[PDB]
Amino acid sequence: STGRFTLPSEENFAEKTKELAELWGADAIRNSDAVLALGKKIYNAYFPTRAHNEWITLHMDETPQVYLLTDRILAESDTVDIPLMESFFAEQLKPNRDADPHKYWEVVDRTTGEVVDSANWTLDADEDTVHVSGVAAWHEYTVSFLAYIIWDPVEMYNHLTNDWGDKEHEIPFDIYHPATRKFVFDTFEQWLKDSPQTDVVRFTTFFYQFTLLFDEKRREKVVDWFGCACTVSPRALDDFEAKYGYRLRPEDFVDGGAYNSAWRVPRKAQRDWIDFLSGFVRENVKQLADMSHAAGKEAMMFLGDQWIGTEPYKDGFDELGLDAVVGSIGDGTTTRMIADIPGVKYTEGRFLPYFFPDTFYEGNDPSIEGLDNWRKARRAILRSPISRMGYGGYLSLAAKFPKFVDTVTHIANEFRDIHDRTGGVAAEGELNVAILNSWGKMRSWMAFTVAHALPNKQTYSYYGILESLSGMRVNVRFISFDDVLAHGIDSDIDVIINGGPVDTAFTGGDVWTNPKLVETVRAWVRGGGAFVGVGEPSSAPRFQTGRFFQLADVIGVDEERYQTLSVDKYFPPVVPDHFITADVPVDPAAREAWEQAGYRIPLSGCGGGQSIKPLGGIDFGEPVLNTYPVNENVTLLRADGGQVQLATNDYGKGRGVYISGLPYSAANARLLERVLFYASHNEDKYAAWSSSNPECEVAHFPEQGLYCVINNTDQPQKTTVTLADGTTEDFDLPDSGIAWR
Amino acid sequence: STGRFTLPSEENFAEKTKELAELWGADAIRNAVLALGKKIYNAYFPTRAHNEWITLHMDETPQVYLLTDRILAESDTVDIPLMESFFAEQLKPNRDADPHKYWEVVDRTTGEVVDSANWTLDADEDTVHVSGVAAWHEYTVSFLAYIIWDPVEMYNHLTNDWGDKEHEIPFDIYHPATRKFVFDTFEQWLKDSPQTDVVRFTTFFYQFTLLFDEKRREKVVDWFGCACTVSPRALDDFEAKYGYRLRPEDFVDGGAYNSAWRVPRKAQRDWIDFLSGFVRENVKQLADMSHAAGKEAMMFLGDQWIGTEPYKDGFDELGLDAVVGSIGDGTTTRMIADIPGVKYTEGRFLPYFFPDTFYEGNDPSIEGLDNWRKARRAILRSPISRMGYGGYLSLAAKFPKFVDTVTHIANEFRDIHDRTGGVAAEGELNVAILNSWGKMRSWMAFTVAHALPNKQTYSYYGILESLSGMRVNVRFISFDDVLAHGIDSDIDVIINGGPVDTAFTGGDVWTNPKLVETVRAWVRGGGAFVGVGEPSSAPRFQTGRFFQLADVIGVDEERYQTLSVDKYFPPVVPDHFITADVPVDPAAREAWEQAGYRIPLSGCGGGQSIKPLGGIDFGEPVLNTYPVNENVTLLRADGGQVQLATNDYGKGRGVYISGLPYSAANARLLERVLFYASHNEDKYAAWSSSNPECEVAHFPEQGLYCVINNTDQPQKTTVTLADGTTEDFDLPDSGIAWRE
Numbered sequence A: 001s002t003g004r005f006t007l008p009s010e011e012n013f014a015e016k017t018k019e020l021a022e023l024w025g026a027d028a029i030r031n032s033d034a035v036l037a038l039g040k041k042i043y044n045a046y047f048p049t050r051a052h053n054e055w056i057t058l059h060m061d062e063t064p065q066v067y068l069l070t071d072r073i074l075a076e077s078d079t080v081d082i083p084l085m086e087s088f089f090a091e092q093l094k095p096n097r098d099a100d101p102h103k104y105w106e107v108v109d110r111t112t113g114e115v116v117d118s119a120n121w122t123l124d125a126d127e128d129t130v131h132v133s134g135v136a137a138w139h140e141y142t143v144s145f146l147a148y149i150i151w152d153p154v155e156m157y158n159h160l161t162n163d164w165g166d167k168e169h170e171i172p173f174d175i176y177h178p179a180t181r182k183f184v185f186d187t188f189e190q191w192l193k194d195s196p197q198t199d200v201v202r203f204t205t206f207f208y209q210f211t212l213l214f215d216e217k218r219r220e221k222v223v224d225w226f227g228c229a230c231t232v233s234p235r236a237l238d239d240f241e242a243k244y245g246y247r248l249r250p251e252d253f254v255d256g257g258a259y260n261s262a263w264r265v266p267r268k269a270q271r272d273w274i275d276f277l278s279g280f281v282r283e284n285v286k287q288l289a290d291m292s293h294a295a296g297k298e299a300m301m302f303l304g305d306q307w308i309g310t311e312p313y314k315d316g317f318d319e320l321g322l323d324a325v326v327g328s329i330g331d332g333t334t335t336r337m338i339a340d341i342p343g344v345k346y347t348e349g350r351f352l353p354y355f356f357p358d359t360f361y362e363g364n365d366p367s368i369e370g371l372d373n374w375r376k377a378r379r380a381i382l383r384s385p386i387s388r389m390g391y392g393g394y395l396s397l398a399a400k401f402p403k404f405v406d407t408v409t410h411i412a413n414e415f416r417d418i419h420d421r422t423g424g425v426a427a428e429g430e431l432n433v434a435i436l437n438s439w440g441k442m443r444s445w446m447a448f449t450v451a452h453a454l455p456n457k458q459t460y461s462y463y464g465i466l467e468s469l470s471g472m473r474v475n476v477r478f479i480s481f482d483d484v485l486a487h488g489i490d491s492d493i494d495v496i497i498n499g500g501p502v503d504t505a506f507t508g509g510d511v512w513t514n515p516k517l518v519e520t521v522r523a524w525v526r527g528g529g530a531f532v533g534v535g536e537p538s539s540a541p542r543f544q545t546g547r548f549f550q551l552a553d554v555i556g557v558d559e560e561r562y563q564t565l566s567v568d569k570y571f572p573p574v575v576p577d578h579f580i581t582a583d584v585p586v587d588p589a590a591r592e593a594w595e596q597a598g599y600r601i602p603l604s605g606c607g608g609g610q611s612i613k614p615l616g617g618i619d620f621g622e623p624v625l626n627t628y629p630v631n632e633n634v635t636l637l638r639a640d641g642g643q644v645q646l647a648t649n650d651y652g653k654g655r656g657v658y659i660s661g662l663p664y665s666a667a668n669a670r671l672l673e674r675v676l677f678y679a680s681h682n683e684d685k686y687a688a689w690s691s692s693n694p695e696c697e698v699a700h701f702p703e704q705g706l707y708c709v710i711n712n713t714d715q716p717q718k719t720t721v722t723l724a725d726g727t728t729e730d731f732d733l734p735d736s737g738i739a740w741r
Numbered sequence B: 001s002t003g004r005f006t007l008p009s010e011e012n013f014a015e016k017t018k019e020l021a022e023l024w025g026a027d028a029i030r031n032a033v034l035a036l037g038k039k040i041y042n043a044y045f046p047t048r049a050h051n052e053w054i055t056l057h058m059d060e061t062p063q064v065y066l067l068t069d070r071i072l073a074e075s076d077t078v079d080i081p082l083m084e085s086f087f088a089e090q091l092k093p094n095r096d097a098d099p100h101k102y103w104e105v106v107d108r109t110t111g112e113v114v115d116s117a118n119w120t121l122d123a124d125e126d127t128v129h130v131s132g133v134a135a136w137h138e139y140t141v142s143f144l145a146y147i148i149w150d151p152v153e154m155y156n157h158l159t160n161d162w163g164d165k166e167h168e169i170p171f172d173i174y175h176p177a178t179r180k181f182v183f184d185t186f187e188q189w190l191k192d193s194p195q196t197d198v199v200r201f202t203t204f205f206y207q208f209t210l211l212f213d214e215k216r217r218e219k220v221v222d223w224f225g226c227a228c229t230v231s232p233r234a235l236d237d238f239e240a241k242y243g244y245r246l247r248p249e250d251f252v253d254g255g256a257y258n259s260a261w262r263v264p265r266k267a268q269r270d271w272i273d274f275l276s277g278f279v280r281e282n283v284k285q286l287a288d289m290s291h292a293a294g295k296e297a298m299m300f301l302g303d304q305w306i307g308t309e310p311y312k313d314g315f316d317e318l319g320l321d322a323v324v325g326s327i328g329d330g331t332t333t334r335m336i337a338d339i340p341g342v343k344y345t346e347g348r349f350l351p352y353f354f355p356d357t358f359y360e361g362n363d364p365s366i367e368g369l370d371n372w373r374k375a376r377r378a379i380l381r382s383p384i385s386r387m388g389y390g391g392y393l394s395l396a397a398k399f400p401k402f403v404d405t406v407t408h409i410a411n412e413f414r415d416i417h418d419r420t421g422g423v424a425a426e427g428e429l430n431v432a433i434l435n436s437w438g439k440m441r442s443w444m445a446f447t448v449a450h451a452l453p454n455k456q457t458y459s460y461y462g463i464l465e466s467l468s469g470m471r472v473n474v475r476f477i478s479f480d481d482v483l484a485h486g487i488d489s490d491i492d493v494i495i496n497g498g499p500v501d502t503a504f505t506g507g508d509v510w511t512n513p514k515l516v517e518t519v520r521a522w523v524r525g526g527g528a529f530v531g532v533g534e535p536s537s538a539p540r541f542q543t544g545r546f547f548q549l550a551d552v553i554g555v556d557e558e559r560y561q562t563l564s565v566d567k568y569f570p571p572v573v574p575d576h577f578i579t580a581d582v583p584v585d586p587a588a589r590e591a592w593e594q595a596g597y598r599i600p601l602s603g604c605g606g607g608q609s610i611k612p613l614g615g616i617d618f619g620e621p622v623l624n625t626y627p628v629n630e631n632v633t634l635l636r637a638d639g640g641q642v643q644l645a646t647n648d649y650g651k652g653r654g655v656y657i658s659g660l661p662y663s664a665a666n667a668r669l670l671e672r673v674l675f676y677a678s679h680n681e682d683k684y685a686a687w688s689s690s691n692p693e694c695e696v697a698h699f700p701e702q703g704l705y706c707v708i709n710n711t712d713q714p715q716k717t718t719v720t721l722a723d724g725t726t727e728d729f730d731l732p733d734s735g736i737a738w739r740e
């Protein structure tokens, strides 16, 4: 096979480019920032807001800008001096002294939340320090100040990662300003004329870079892949005031030091700013796409970098007329972020690892992550196909890693074989599952992300929900509390999942104190709905003394918040042999120890029924302390260490399930899959197209008269598939393998 | 020396009673041996043991507001069973006091009280019929119930399988007829009890919250709880005095029943004041009567002790001769010992003389000595006057090793008293525990059921257990104290500990800038602040700061609002004064050193150790604590978060500890924390034991010190004296040594 593969080229590397193009079956080449001779489709990456220092050096007040929050400084008398730049990278960020600081900045008493009157502070003429007087001693104070971004965040990251030393730093520019906007469009018009051979303009990306701010030690300081920090200017702020009827505070951006993280329950000012920016971004993206098209070229957008304000999952994205979106793939969730976008002709995955020396260094084996990423993306692709794949970075760097080079040959062949055999259509999905949160559709597959593709200690127990779902045999949608409150719950939905910690966009915050939301979900489950809550689902703090999870009644579990310690909690015996946990292997010795130690007997002020030893066997990630069964009719499936990890509760005709956390693994995907079939009273439907081995999965393509079976592990796996007729069929899959039937 | 010892006795056991009295140096006997020359204690139970009275005045039993289970409405009607979740042998809905006046039906989904016109109480079953309500909401009734079985007598019946034995019905002296009966009966009992020297009141008028469920298990307990203290009469009177009307909700408290862990509300404090005035007047009368009859009056610190408030000003005005209480551990010893307003104090030690521990094959002396050692370390810091045991002497007599053990304990209790003159050891630092309650709950923080710390509490209770026998002076202060008067200038260290939104951390008081100013200024001037768990926490006040004093202690807790900000952890300092006595684990240290620290990665911060150093039991985790800057000293920061840290703050210091279960090592850890945080490292060595399993008590007046072995194993230790000289000791099992 050949094709559906983009190769990155490099100058003075003609022979090996040609050799790798042949080896990997490349049908497009993405040129550096014999490619003509190969006669493949040509992509040129285009950088609308950088790569022209000779422009922006003449117009330095037109760089993009950001509100920055200083460290908190303690007043030891009725005065404080606050250094502006001590905690920031001075090669990236410069305080804006041009735009009246008393109009644009804010000094805040963080101990009280009060804005300090601008009459009480002065900016030092000679150093980046604000002097404050007439304030309370023993409070903490900060400045929120406008800063110019004098180094493109991503180009800077590239420089630092590659140790480019004294190579000139690229200064970014902001097309909000008419001079720069005219420059960008004029320059693009000429580039088009000067680039007759380019087939695809790969905009990498457009106008506003996601929040990416570095510190005084040259480390990342603040990151949010969705963040709008790097999008302000005196002019845009003043224009916003005229258009929206109110003036944004610096606080509306720095957000008490949260910088409007996507995890924060979204505020109207955030939504308004997104609306303001997107109208402007989309208008200008449309013009770039129209120019590309008139020049006989395709317009392709990278899902990342300067993608702020594009909103690929908001209505109207299709009207931009972008031909394609290409995105970074490191797993199934990030695959689906790209694959599910409706408004384009085709999609492309640029697989991790990027060809940079942070991964490609002597002693490291990149083929391991390479194939791990593929296994995770592969299951997602079977559920929602992407048209094309490829890689990025220095081809000469990857070329020196023969094992990885072989791994890419394997992946590329298998990608093509999957497309060829499936005809590029999605596998048949078996249940309709809706993730409910504050954002809904606009953040499809985007819940729980902070840095793209990089879940961490704080997030992985929830990101694992999406990762499991990304390659699972169900149909997944993303809905918001606004949707549910305006329209109820759609009659085709089988299961609603609500997951995350308390007081976030993902659980929903005080929306759970809205009686109409509680009524809607309760009535729907009672009628045969299924509600799966993960971590602190439906949580609303200090609304009811005795109830933290507002839907504790549904899922059978609440979290003790140290207000109800007088109330003895009684745990019913765990049911170790249950549909949901059927695929969990428990060590015989572990199960014996659990059986032998028994359950706590009631003791004053200590409740009773908790297992003295754990049953274990499931990685539930981060604990939720002191979860407990609300009554003895809930079924406990895991309740180790004196609290609950896993429970199911009958609620009228439907069911609630509680999961304390769910990091991704093949086994946990199976656990969640059993949860969805069980909670919706569809246990009967599970058998058809199931894999006996928990670490393998099946994808059924009725149209092609076909099914495949994938091994989700780097180990050999034997498995038995059950067809819809009842008959079984056996497989012996090698490491990371696939078979078709 | 003889005496300071109370012996239990029983019918037909005169011979052995005299023998053991002589062997143990007993000077008191409790329940024909009435004719021995000993002080005679008789228990008195003012609110029970008189079913002949109360069965003719059943509207005068004590009452309690009860909260039903939450019932889901699936239409505009809902029926709420009143009694399905409660023990019907203990509790009965009050049908005499107009339910529409005294009860509340609540929509828990909205918090609104359902109007009287929308509900009725079924005439024939204990069910409330609600109509005109919203489908898919949860509803509850808060109803008055008579308590028809004394809760402690009930507990003993259930625990000891007393079967068909008559249930004792309790009664409430708030009603004048019952009150008059209680006093007339006592007047007559005193007349009829000439050989009684000490009336052991067990206890007085109101039982601590103790409610059982339909399965005969405990449902709700609070050793401090005021639930079982209401009546229509008392509720109306409170309104008369305080000028506002209490709701049933002021008692049920959303299902929390006013747990001492709840940040206290004005209505709770007003109720305590209301109740305590009544209880106190009536206790004084009982004590006055005892005294007029030539008897002493002794209060049990427990059971019906609600409203006595032994740590509140004016307790001394009662004229109680003594408090006796249950010795469960060091903390519970201090609860008794520190009470200032009585003439003497008495501990009832373990084991109780009962077949549950006194059975063939068991060795009760182990528990006996465990109990003594736990109490003894506290007694050196705050002496108690007397010891003793309870239960069946005939059972203890059958265990000769146990008898020999008690002989030793009693002799040692008296020896300590004699050598020290009943004076507290010198304290080396002044430590104040700061919470919502302060002095009125001295040694009482973190308790739910007496002497029964559990998963949710032990990480904080260990603070008190550590301090209970520690060589420092401990006081309990409130936020109200600090706001009114500032921080007393003799205090060296303040400790604030507990989870967020509890009386122990303080709740929204930490958003009051005067509190923050006062504490910060005081630390900056050389004070020491030790915060444990979620100290100074205030939820949703500042987006970027959860612990309001994170700047002092150098640690905050990530609340998933600030995930965009990379957290950078400085390298841990494994060799430090604070952790100098933590047992080293060479293999753990080796693997930790070898694995190194995480390098910065986007969205993941950096600097966290890849493997844990470990070595310290911090109890329950506080997830995602992080250092606020890189100048904080991390002492333990395993598993991507912080357990132990110290931060300089002007002249003073802050220390963060995520949790502190009691142990010898952890009490040493806390002790080193106190000396270090107060810049008193140079003062640490004076009057100290090198071995953490031993403790030192200095009596500068008596020109004396002792060193005690807190374990049942031999312990060598070196004691350092004020002048820098040292002395080595080889302490036997449970031993003690005295020196000049």
Ligand SMILES: CC(=O)N[C@@H]1[C@@H](O)[C@H](O)[C@@H](CO)O[C@@H]1O
Pocket (backbone or CB within 6 Å): A154, A157, A158, A303, A304, A305, A327, A328, A452, B602
């Ligand atoms: C898909 C996307 O936006 N990728 C960017 C990448 O370009 C950038 O170099 C990196 C910096 O940390 O962050 C993200 O991974």
Ligand SMILES: CC(=O)N[C@@H]1[C@@H](O)[C@H](O)[C@@H](CO)O[C@@H]1O
Pocket (backbone or CB within 6 Å): A604, B152, B155, B301, B302, B303, B326, B450
């Ligand atoms: C000191 C005190 O009040 N002790 C009581 C005890 O009398 C009672 O039997 C028990 C019931 O659970 O509770 C407490 O332990």
Ligand SMILES: [Mg+2]
Pocket (backbone or CB within 6 Å): A087, A215, B629
């Ligand atoms: Mg910093």
Ligand SMILES: [Mg+2]
Pocket (backbone or CB within 6 Å): A039, A040, A041, A197
């Ligand atoms: Mg061509």
Ligand SMILES: [Mg+2]
Pocket (backbone or CB within 6 Å): A542, B263
């Ligand atoms: Mg509250």
Ligand SMILES: [Mg+2]
Pocket (backbone or CB within 6 Å): A631, B085, B213
């Ligand atoms: Mg119950």
Ligand SMILES: [Mg+2]
Pocket (backbone or CB within 6 Å): none
């Ligand atoms: Mg019935």
Ligand SMILES: [Mg+2]
Pocket (backbone or CB within 6 Å): B233, B236, B237
């Ligand atoms: Mg009256």
Ligand SMILES: [Mg+2]
Pocket (backbone or CB within 6 Å): A265, B540
């Ligand atoms: Mg908020």
Ligand SMILES: [Mg+2]
Pocket (backbone or CB within 6 Å): B585
């Ligand atoms: Mg070891």
